Design a protein around this motif. Sequence first.
Motif, PDB file in Angstrom:
ATOM      1  N   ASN A  29       0.816  -1.216   0.000  1.00  0.00           N
ATOM      2  CA  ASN A  29       0.000   0.000   0.000  1.00  0.00           C
ATOM      3  C   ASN A  29       0.850   1.267   0.000  1.00  0.00           C
ATOM      4  O   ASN A  29       0.696   2.115   0.873  1.00  0.00           O
ATOM      5  N   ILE A  30       1.737   1.406  -0.979  1.00  0.00           N
ATOM      6  CA  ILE A  30       2.600   2.587  -1.048  1.00  0.00           C
ATOM      7  C   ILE A  30       1.804   3.885  -1.176  1.00  0.00           C
ATOM      8  O   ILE A  30       2.223   4.926  -0.677  1.00  0.00           O
ATOM      9  N   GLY A  31       0.659   3.826  -1.846  1.00  0.00           N
ATOM     10  CA  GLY A  31      -0.140   5.025  -1.998  1.00  0.00           C
ATOM     11  C   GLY A  31      -0.538   5.577  -0.648  1.00  0.00           C
ATOM     12  O   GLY A  31      -0.268   6.731  -0.330  1.00  0.00           O
ATOM     13  N   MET A  32      -1.174   4.733   0.155  1.00  0.00           N
ATOM     14  CA  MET A  32      -1.617   5.113   1.484  1.00  0.00           C
ATOM     15  C   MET A  32      -0.457   5.530   2.387  1.00  0.00           C
ATOM     16  O   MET A  32      -0.601   6.431   3.209  1.00  0.00           O
ATOM     17  N   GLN A  33       0.693   4.880   2.247  1.00  0.00           N
ATOM     18  CA  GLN A  33       1.835   5.241   3.078  1.00  0.00           C
ATOM     19  C   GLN A  33       2.298   6.656   2.771  1.00  0.00           C
ATOM     20  O   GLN A  33       2.640   7.410   3.675  1.00  0.00           O
ATOM     21  N   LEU A  34       2.291   7.022   1.496  1.00  0.00           N
ATOM     22  CA  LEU A  34       2.705   8.356   1.095  1.00  0.00           C
ATOM     23  C   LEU A  34       1.688   9.408   1.499  1.00  0.00           C
ATOM     24  O   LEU A  34       2.067  10.526   1.837  1.00  0.00           O
ATOM     25  N   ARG A  35       0.401   9.053   1.466  1.00  0.00           N
ATOM     26  CA  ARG A  35      -0.666   9.978   1.862  1.00  0.00           C
ATOM     27  C   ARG A  35      -0.582  10.280   3.355  1.00  0.00           C
ATOM     28  O   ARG A  35      -0.733  11.428   3.768  1.00  0.00           O
ATOM     29  N   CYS A  36      -0.346   9.251   4.161  1.00  0.00           N
ATOM     30  CA  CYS A  36      -0.248   9.426   5.603  1.00  0.00           C
ATOM     31  C   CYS A  36       0.990  10.205   6.033  1.00  0.00           C
ATOM     32  O   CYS A  36       0.972  10.907   7.037  1.00  0.00           O
ATOM     33  N   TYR A  37       2.069  10.078   5.278  1.00  0.00           N
ATOM     34  CA  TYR A  37       3.287  10.799   5.604  1.00  0.00           C
ATOM     35  C   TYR A  37       3.089  12.278   5.309  1.00  0.00           C
ATOM     36  O   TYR A  37       3.448  13.131   6.112  1.00  0.00           O
ATOM     37  N   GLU A  38       2.518  12.576   4.149  1.00  0.00           N
ATOM     38  CA  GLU A  38       2.285  13.958   3.762  1.00  0.00           C
ATOM     39  C   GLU A  38       1.296  14.641   4.693  1.00  0.00           C
ATOM     40  O   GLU A  38       1.372  15.849   4.912  1.00  0.00           O
ATOM     41  N   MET A  39       0.372  13.868   5.248  1.00  0.00           N
ATOM     42  CA  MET A  39      -0.597  14.425   6.172  1.00  0.00           C
ATOM     43  C   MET A  39       0.121  14.768   7.477  1.00  0.00           C
ATOM     44  O   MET A  39      -0.082  15.840   8.053  1.00  0.00           O
ATOM     45  N   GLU A  40       0.963  13.847   7.930  1.00  0.00           N
ATOM     46  CA  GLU A  40       1.717  14.026   9.161  1.00  0.00           C
ATOM     47  C   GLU A  40       2.685  15.191   9.108  1.00  0.00           C
ATOM     48  O   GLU A  40       3.188  15.629  10.136  1.00  0.00           O
ATOM     49  N   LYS A  41       2.964  15.689   7.912  1.00  0.00           N
ATOM     50  CA  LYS A  41       3.845  16.840   7.780  1.00  0.00           C
ATOM     51  C   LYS A  41       2.952  18.057   7.952  1.00  0.00           C
ATOM     52  O   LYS A  41       3.306  19.004   8.651  1.00  0.00           O
ATOM     53  N   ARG A  42       1.782  18.009   7.315  1.00  0.00           N
ATOM     54  CA  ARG A  42       0.813  19.096   7.390  1.00  0.00           C
ATOM     55  C   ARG A  42       0.357  19.349   8.818  1.00  0.00           C
ATOM     56  O   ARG A  42       0.022  20.473   9.175  1.00  0.00           O
ATOM     57  N   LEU A  43       0.334  18.302   9.632  1.00  0.00           N
ATOM     58  CA  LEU A  43      -0.087  18.439  11.019  1.00  0.00           C
ATOM     59  C   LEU A  43       1.125  18.510  11.925  1.00  0.00           C
ATOM     60  O   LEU A  43       0.977  18.653  13.131  1.00  0.00           O
ATOM     61  N   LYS A  44       2.320  18.406  11.346  1.00  0.00           N
ATOM     62  CA  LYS A  44       3.568  18.452  12.113  1.00  0.00           C
ATOM     63  C   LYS A  44       3.499  17.516  13.315  1.00  0.00           C
ATOM     64  O   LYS A  44       3.577  17.953  14.459  1.00  0.00           O
ATOM     65  N   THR A  45       3.364  16.223  13.039  1.00  0.00           N
ATOM     66  CA  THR A  45       3.255  15.196  14.075  1.00  0.00           C
ATOM     67  C   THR A  45       4.599  14.790  14.682  1.00  0.00           C
ATOM     68  O   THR A  45       5.503  14.325  13.977  1.00  0.00           O
ATOM     69  N   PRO A  46       4.738  14.951  16.009  1.00  0.00           N
ATOM     70  CA  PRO A  46       5.961  14.609  16.749  1.00  0.00           C
ATOM     71  C   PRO A  46       6.352  13.138  16.561  1.00  0.00           C
ATOM     72  O   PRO A  46       7.493  12.751  16.811  1.00  0.00           O
ATOM     73  N   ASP A  47       5.390  12.331  16.120  1.00  0.00           N
ATOM     74  CA  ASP A  47       5.604  10.905  15.889  1.00  0.00           C
ATOM     75  C   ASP A  47       6.602  10.645  14.768  1.00  0.00           C
ATOM     76  O   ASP A  47       7.416   9.723  14.858  1.00  0.00           O
ATOM     77  N   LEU A  48       6.538  11.463  13.719  1.00  0.00           N
ATOM     78  CA  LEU A  48       7.432  11.329  12.570  1.00  0.00           C
ATOM     79  C   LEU A  48       8.913  11.308  12.969  1.00  0.00           C
ATOM     80  O   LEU A  48       9.780  10.971  12.159  1.00  0.00           O
ATOM     81  N   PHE A  49       9.196  11.664  14.218  1.00  0.00           N
ATOM     82  CA  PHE A  49      10.568  11.674  14.727  1.00  0.00           C
ATOM     83  C   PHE A  49      11.089  10.234  14.915  1.00  0.00           C
ATOM     84  O   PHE A  49      12.278  10.018  15.199  1.00  0.00           O
ATOM     85  N   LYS A  50      10.190   9.261  14.751  1.00  0.00           N
ATOM     86  CA  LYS A  50      10.529   7.845  14.892  1.00  0.00           C
ATOM     87  C   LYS A  50      10.996   7.228  13.577  1.00  0.00           C
ATOM     88  O   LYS A  50      11.622   6.170  13.577  1.00  0.00           O
ATOM     89  N   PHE A  51      10.680   7.884  12.461  1.00  0.00           N
ATOM     90  CA  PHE A  51      11.117   7.427  11.142  1.00  0.00           C
ATOM     91  C   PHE A  51      11.724   8.663  10.466  1.00  0.00           C
ATOM     92  O   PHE A  51      11.274   9.100   9.408  1.00  0.00           O
ATOM     93  N   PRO A  52      12.778   9.231  11.071  1.00  0.00           N
ATOM     94  CA  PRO A  52      13.439  10.424  10.538  1.00  0.00           C
ATOM     95  C   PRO A  52      13.765  10.379   9.054  1.00  0.00           C
ATOM     96  O   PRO A  52      13.695  11.401   8.369  1.00  0.00           O
ATOM     97  N   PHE A  53      14.119   9.198   8.559  1.00  0.00           N
ATOM     98  CA  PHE A  53      14.514   9.067   7.169  1.00  0.00           C
ATOM     99  C   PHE A  53      13.561   8.250   6.320  1.00  0.00           C
ATOM    100  O   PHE A  53      13.964   7.336   5.604  1.00  0.00           O
ATOM    101  N   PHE A  54      12.287   8.608   6.407  1.00  0.00           N
ATOM    102  CA  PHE A  54      11.236   7.953   5.656  1.00  0.00           C
ATOM    103  C   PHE A  54      11.442   8.214   4.169  1.00  0.00           C
ATOM    104  O   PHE A  54      11.141   7.371   3.327  1.00  0.00           O
ATOM    105  N   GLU A  55      11.952   9.396   3.849  1.00  0.00           N
ATOM    106  CA  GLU A  55      12.178   9.745   2.457  1.00  0.00           C
ATOM    107  C   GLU A  55      13.373   8.995   1.888  1.00  0.00           C
ATOM    108  O   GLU A  55      13.355   8.579   0.727  1.00  0.00           O
ATOM    109  N   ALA A  56      14.402   8.813   2.714  1.00  0.00           N
ATOM    110  CA  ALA A  56      15.602   8.096   2.300  1.00  0.00           C
ATOM    111  C   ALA A  56      15.226   6.691   1.832  1.00  0.00           C
ATOM    112  O   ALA A  56      15.612   6.260   0.739  1.00  0.00           O
TER     113      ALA A  56
END
Length: 366
Positions: free
Chosen positions: A261-288
């Motif tokens: 489900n790469i589509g959904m994974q990318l949608r959720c990541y972009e949303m988490e940026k828009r909401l600036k979720t502190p959780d994203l600090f657990k996968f610092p290199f999601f883009e890498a």
Amino acid sequence: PVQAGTRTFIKELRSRVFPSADEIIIKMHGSQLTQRYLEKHGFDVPIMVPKLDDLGLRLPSPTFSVMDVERYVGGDKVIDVIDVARQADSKMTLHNYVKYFMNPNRPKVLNVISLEFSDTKMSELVEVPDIAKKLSWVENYWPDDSVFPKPFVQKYCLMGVQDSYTDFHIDFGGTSVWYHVLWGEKIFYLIKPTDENLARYESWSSSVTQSEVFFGDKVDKCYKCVVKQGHTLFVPTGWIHAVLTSQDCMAFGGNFLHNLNIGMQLRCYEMEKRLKTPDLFKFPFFEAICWFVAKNLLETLKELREDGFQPQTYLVQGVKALHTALKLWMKKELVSEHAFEIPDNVRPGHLIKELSKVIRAIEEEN
Ligand SMILES: O=C(O)CCC(=O)C(=O)O
Ligand SMILES: [Fe+2]
Ligand SMILES: [Fe+2]
């Protein structure tokens, strides 16, 4: 106003009779849960595995206590603890939490859900489900020669007291997750990631009254899923969920990205940026990792193409999704914040081009 986490909020939560999770989840044997199975039937709903037979999941017996965790981990480690009534993040020592946990008179409801121990002595006591390791992006595409450190989000130990409540959320980076209850009991409230539900969730997240508004009331259905001892639950990408510790519990879990489900994974990541979720600090290199995956998925396609084969549906959709994302991160007016995440082994401009045509072909040659 009924605040999330409070004794009152819990009275209402424990009384509502939600539609059963049986209406949507699939119960299967550890042997039935294979990558082959998933690639055909898809991984679009929670999968329940009652007995741990054949999952490849190894872990301490039902008697492993909270005291043992302090031994194997070290009461010194400072952990994130949740003051459920205030839905706020605190700090403590594994030593002080256990002291609190074992005292019969708990003055407050505190929960532990972020204790990652793969870097400790308690790691040898646990082996994650084979399926999780088969799908995991970190397990299959993370080069042993990158500057970025490999993420440790595969082994978490959860310890919560009765009535610990985690409000609705989507796992960091849009990762899937596996969950096993050693003893005690957890109750999951599951919401399907329909476009309607995702928009509403992002709306509820960026509103001041979030803590006085039960998100379950804003969607059509909020499935109640009871995870009893010995059971393993696998929650797929983008699923919105809240969890209630119906009774003193200890559970283990982990997160993992995959090609389904790469589509959904990318949608959720972009949303988490828009909401600036502190959780994203657990996968610092999601883009890498997304670049690493794109290189691999490009290869698979280049092959199937130069031999006259058509790719599976989820693979075209997924790659086409990565394409848009990689291209968006390179926009002149944005590349300055994404640049450091581009691996030194990848040629950004070129890859996005190879993807472009490979997709062009498939689209046309069909
Ligand atoms: O146990 C909890 O209170 C929350 C767990 C959770 O959200 C997860 O494993 O994805
Ligand atoms: Fe979660
Ligand atoms: Fe992963």
